[PDB]
Amino acid sequence: MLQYDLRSARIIGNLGGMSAELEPLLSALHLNDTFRRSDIADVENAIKAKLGERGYGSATVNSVPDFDDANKTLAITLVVDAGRRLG
């Protein structure tokens, strides 16, 4: 029943050098429209898959909101940690 719109999104943290390859994945999110959990999960999975491809197989992603209850918006920050390559 969450009817806030997603106002913005960003990726931060430890991106294993792949910041430029991750950033375009955010273009899948529907900004200024109703928030959709599954759109955020899809981005989180894509991030981890891109990072997997360079050897960061234990990468984590945690999506953190910033709510504006006045405007009925939230910003999402995807906090990435690439982890160790292999060992």
Curated annotation (Swiss-Prot):
Highest taxon, organism lineage: Bacteria
Subcellular location: Cell outer membrane
Domain POTRA, residue spans: 4-83
Assembly, per entry: Part of the Bam complex.
Function field: Part of the outer membrane protein assembly complex, which is involved in assembly and insertion of beta-barrel proteins into the outer membrane.
Family per similarity comment: Belongs to the BamA family.
Name of the protein described by the UniProt record: Outer membrane protein assembly factor BamA
Gene: bamA
From-to range in the entire protein, with total length: 260 to 344 of 797
